[PDB]
Amino acid sequence: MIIGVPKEIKNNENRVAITPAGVLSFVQAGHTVLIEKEAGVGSGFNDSDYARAGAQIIERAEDVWAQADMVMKVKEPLPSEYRFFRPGLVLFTYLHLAADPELTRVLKESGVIAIAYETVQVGRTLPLLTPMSEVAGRMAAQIGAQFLEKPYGGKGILLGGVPGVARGKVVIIGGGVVGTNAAKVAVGLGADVTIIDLNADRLRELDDIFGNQITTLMSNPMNIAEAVAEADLVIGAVLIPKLVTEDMVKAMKPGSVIVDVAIDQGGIVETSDHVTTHDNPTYVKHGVVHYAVANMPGAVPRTSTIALTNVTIPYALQIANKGVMQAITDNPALELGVNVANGEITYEAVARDLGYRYVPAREALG
Amino acid sequence: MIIGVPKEIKNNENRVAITPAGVLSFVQAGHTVLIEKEAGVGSGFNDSDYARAGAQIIERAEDVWAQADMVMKVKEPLPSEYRFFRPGLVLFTYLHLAADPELTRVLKESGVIAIAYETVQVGRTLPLLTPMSEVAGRMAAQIGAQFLEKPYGGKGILLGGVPGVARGKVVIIGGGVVGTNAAKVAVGLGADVTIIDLNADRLRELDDIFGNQITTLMSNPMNIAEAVAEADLVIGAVLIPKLVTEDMVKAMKPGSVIVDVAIDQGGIVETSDHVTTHDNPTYVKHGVVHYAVANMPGAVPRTSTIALTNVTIPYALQIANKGVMQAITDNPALELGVNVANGEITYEAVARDLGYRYVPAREALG
Amino acid sequence: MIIGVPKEIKNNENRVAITPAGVLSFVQAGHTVLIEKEAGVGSGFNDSDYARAGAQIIERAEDVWAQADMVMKVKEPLPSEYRFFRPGLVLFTYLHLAADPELTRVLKESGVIAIAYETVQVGRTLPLLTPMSEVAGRMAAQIGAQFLEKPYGGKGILLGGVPGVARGKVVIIGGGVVGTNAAKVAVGLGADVTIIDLNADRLRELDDIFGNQITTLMSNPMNIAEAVAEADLVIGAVLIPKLVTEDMVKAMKPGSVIVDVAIDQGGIVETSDHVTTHDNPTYVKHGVVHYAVANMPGAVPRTSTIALTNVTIPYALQIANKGVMQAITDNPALELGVNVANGEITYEAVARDLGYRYVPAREALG
Amino acid sequence: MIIGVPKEIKNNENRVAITPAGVLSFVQAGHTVLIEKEAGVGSGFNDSDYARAGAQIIERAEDVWAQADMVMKVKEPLPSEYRFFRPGLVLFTYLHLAADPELTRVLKESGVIAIAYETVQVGRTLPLLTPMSEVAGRMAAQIGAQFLEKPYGGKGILLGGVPGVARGKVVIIGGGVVGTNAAKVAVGLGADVTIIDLNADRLRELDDIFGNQITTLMSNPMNIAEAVAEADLVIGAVLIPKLVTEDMVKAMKPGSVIVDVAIDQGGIVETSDHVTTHDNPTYVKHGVVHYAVANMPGAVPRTSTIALTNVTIPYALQIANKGVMQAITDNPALELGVNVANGEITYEAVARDLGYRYVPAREALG
Numbered sequence A, B, C, D: 001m002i003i004g005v006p007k008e009i010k011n012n013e014n015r016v017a018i019t020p021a022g023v024l025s026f027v028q029a030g031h032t033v034l035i036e037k038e039a040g041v042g043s044g045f046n047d048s049d050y051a052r053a054g055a056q057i058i059e060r061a062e063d064v065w066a067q068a069d070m071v072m073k074v075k076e077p078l079p080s081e082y083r084f085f086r087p088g089l090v091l092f093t094y095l096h097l098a099a100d101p102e103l104t105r106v107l108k109e110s111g112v113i114a115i116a117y118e119t120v121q122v123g124r125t126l127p128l129l130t131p132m133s134e135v136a137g138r139m140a141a142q143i144g145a146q147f148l149e150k151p152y153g154g155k156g157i158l159l160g161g162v163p164g165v166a167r168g169k170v171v172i173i174g175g176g177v178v179g180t181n182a183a184k185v186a187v188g189l190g191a192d193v194t195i196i197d198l199n200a201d202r203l204r205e206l207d208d209i210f211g212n213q214i215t216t217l218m219s220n221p222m223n224i225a226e227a228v229a230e231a232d233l234v235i236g237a238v239l240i241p242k243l244v245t246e247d248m249v250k251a252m253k254p255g256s257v258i259v260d261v262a263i264d265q266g267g268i269v270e271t272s273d274h275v276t277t278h279d280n281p282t283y284v285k286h287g288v289v290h291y292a293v294a295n296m297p298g299a300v301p302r303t304s305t306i307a308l309t310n311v312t313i314p315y316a317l318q319i320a321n322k323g324v325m326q327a328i329t330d331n332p333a334l335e336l337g338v339n340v341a342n343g344e345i346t347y348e349a350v351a352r353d354l355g356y357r358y359v360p361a362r363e364a365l366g
Ligand SMILES: NC(=O)c1ccc[n+]([C@@H]2O[C@H](COP(=O)([O-])OP(=O)(O)OC[C@H]3O[C@@H](n4cnc5c(N)ncnc54)[C@H](O)[C@@H]3O)[C@@H](O)[C@H]2O)c1
Pocket: A124, A125, A126, A127, A129, A130, A131, A133, A173, A174, A175, A176, A177, A178, A179, A196, A197, A198, A199, A202, A219, A237, A238, A239, A240, A243
């Protein structure tokens, strides 16, 4: 198979859907990899690095997509890329089709086999989304610390204090992948950290991981109100009626900070109702700084690329070795990735949400 | 030399001034040790244990004191023991002579060489008092936890909480030997622990020992007021105008507990103005339980005996090998131990406080 | 729905089946909550706290039970409360019906829908019993430390020793919820801690949680005999022929302590054959102190109330929102809670043990 | 005595030379404190907070300086404040007189008793500079992490990586107060941290503090070259020929970051030859981002104020209680603070460096 990785073109997107490590996995298993010029550079991988791993460097986006059996990306194709679609092309990337009626329609009618990173799933987890959740949680505590600096609108404290000075209070809401990764960094900055979760077994697991390094708190509206009022930094760690209400935010001390990782989806914090750009990253409501930039992992493209590609490529490699049909037969997790194939919407919830007829991927590809 | 160790006779005193380990140190260096029957039993050392180490077991208190060159004890001789004094007798024990005008007078006029554990001193520390300070601090957090149990008058919490439940707040005032030993146990019980100290370098040392396991807080009246109000347990760790005022105690939550280790000396907590017995161990003022039992180390006599004897006997052994005069010549720390010799008060502060003429121990023994 | 929470009336029962946090969960979801006067006070929640959360404060027990659709408690109704039963009343509390033939008969014939906290079950665990197991294990190490104090009959040591003095040996038998919670506190007190378990995978899990902070030991009679003989404190952490025999206890050092958490059920320690009250808390057999007070969590009512209510109320809230029938249809864990409904014994093992006809709760409620 | 604390007027200076805690120390000891409006607000202390502690709030800078015996500040008086000087006025603040020939001349000829925080000294340490060193080191690792984000010019990594991804390399040069505080935060962010120091005993002390959490490396030019080349982040932790050479920086990987805490004094990094403002915070040389903003502690004014005032006020309080002459007689550390009194330069190194006659402070004040 021939695999192609164009440079990401969305604004300030510095990640890339393969690394030299990925190229070498494909080349060792008999395959050919094409990389557009400067694809890796935002993630500090140069054309020479990809070439040394055994890839061909391709001048023009167009020739990568045209010469490849499968294109891998990080983001969704933009309209400027619809031109490169073709029947039987495999596209492997983050798609978010349920919220992109238009992209779905063009993929469907262009004959694309479109595989979504975010719907590959083993049990209750999505293994190709986990890496960005992890990165996101690590980032949240770091960004929280930055916006607690007076120059960025914060009340001007260190989470760790210094000897003889009290520590900052970090309240994390949600103790899964995002929250657990945030708690590691917030404990490392020297904060008093409290992790709030609905699920008492998850709190027991966190008590076995963290011990005395944190406080675990059952999630209910009084526990959240009381915790958030005392908090220097609140981290909304629940990606999925709002858990932190305007009245709760109103009770917070001026110059406190709120980082809500689900800001793109509305958030769990009522006051965090809108997103913002890198150049205008916060707004203040009731004296409280709200960090509104989405795609935190986007701020550490090199970590985010390696974490993503560490888990995407072993899936991509099944497709290269076996072709899509055998790969999704052999691997039910990959099967749930196929959103579009051969004229049909092949993922139930996308079909339902947008009004097409669910057609199973295996059936669709016959 | 012949060394004698009577059984302690003060009420419920279970410690003892030597262990088999001590006996064996003396016997190996040429000496004879006498132990009264049941001397060690409150500390779980039996006559057979002392005998196996090479000691003689003596039926009657009187014969131990009469046959011995030096008697070692833990407490001060009671009036019931003045009868056993004699000129040239060495007594090595805890004396507290500055606060016992009467005992001092009888020791002076009986011709006793009286050596106080608590005035042996190297630099700024008293090495034969350190062990009871350590034991005391370890005990304070344990006793604090007990009196936070509802049956003992406390509000009924675990310092550690359980998963999903907040931890208790322990505020320790004083970050030296007592406080540092208390913080180890309070952190181990799972409390949020704050250590308050005047000395910013000591707070830096505690931050290097404990890291993120505690909060260090500079000592001033607002820091103490604010910390004590939030505290489930306050531990007064300063042995030396009161640091915790009635108004501060009044702001505390009902069922909170105060353990003040200097209760014998007045305390640093205004409300803790009196001491109490094991059978009536607390009183409540403003809803706050005050643990009033003195001699905490007395509750763990076996640990307290071993910790004491580990450091008293190497000093006692210099006296056995060299006689008092050479021992105090060779060892200035031991010299400062001699409070009474040969008619004179040989420790300045005792002479001053009680109105006798300071006479140096070396001069006094000539 | 109207929910009522009387004050617990068993002797010295200071817990309570709801907190302001619970009240607010019910009020936000459309419900009415009634609280009898002084219900929360043993757990340090006042009528004003419940009122501020949106509850009505009710003068007389009788009016709470009469005006409520569902009564929540901690303990079983006493005979003095049979008067308040009525057909169609929901009672949610700890029942222990298999061991209370009489209570079961009155609940059956009074027409009560009786739901037992202790038989709600997900897989192999009982989620509404877990919190008291956790509290119990945390308490066991603390009580162990207390009874090792000479005034309480112990040999007079600190588990942690002090510098230059050996640590105490804690042997915990059973490495599940109770034992794991005890090991956290015993390690925190500075003990040498050994955890004995039958299940080598649980020992591997404990080695990953605790590392070098403990010794894991396979459970067999020689490992237990040898461990218990060396132990200052033994904690029986197995709730379910006796694992510690009289001969094993006989080999222990005088002034050692045994806390057996299953004392109510006979225990795993042969010598611990009877229970005792707070005022007479131990007996000595073969020189070994046996702590015989049951209901350890009862000594920290405030922690125990919050830990219980953190998990009981989300179940109670399904009943309030959906009524018993829909709640147990939708939630098999809650279903296994229903012990008595509408004339029938609706929990197999209660029916079998007491000689009634098992009738499924859904069938029974038709 | 009357103490006055004006609002700091240097650009973006948000610290303040007293807190309510400080006010209360002064008021309890008989003194009067004046605070200008909005003095504390950059540090989140409001006029109401100072008033509640017992201070008078003063409308105009001028009236604070005129009515006060002693003015306390954080920064040096600006020219705009020379007007408020007067003979016999005590000024207590950070002065840096050796590098301010002009300020020194005006203080001398205005008759000011000028006491420098930064020359109070006990042994080899300056206790009123320690707090900003601590804050500075804590900040350096946090700022380092920020500038490793791609949007701030960095190569785009997390220091901690995520599971399956390598950690970032932090190299700290200097293992004293600044470096040790940086290492705590860099270890907490999950970096591989190496601390370089000349002094092998300091490396032994760091190995006892940190254990396996760091690598200690002896300082020599090859160790530094090799460490810096492998480093994602270098922190210059030496306040005092350059330790990191342009050739060493040239060998670093593009998008690496250098935070040199002595940037104000020239730095230990050759490439870091100039300082920059908050709005233009870095420059790139040889692909390496150089953070050039000075006064890091200035970014966390509230922590910095509390850490400073925790140690300045106990010195200020000796002056209030005893007057300058007795205070500096009784306290040699404070004595070395007096830089200017009563016409003379009273600190040797200032006199020498600027060409005046050293006159001892006690002599000068006669
Ligand atoms: N698309 C999704 O959001 C989704 C759904 C299921 C699982 N996942 C998996 O988890 C990752 C996403 O990270 P995540 O940390 O947000 O999810 P997660 O499942 O790892 O954790 C979410 C946590 O939030 C807790 N929670 C839910 N409601 C809460 C409330 N009201 N109050 C407090 N806590 C509450 C849950 O108990 C859980 O522990 C993905 O990488 C995937 O592996 C994703």
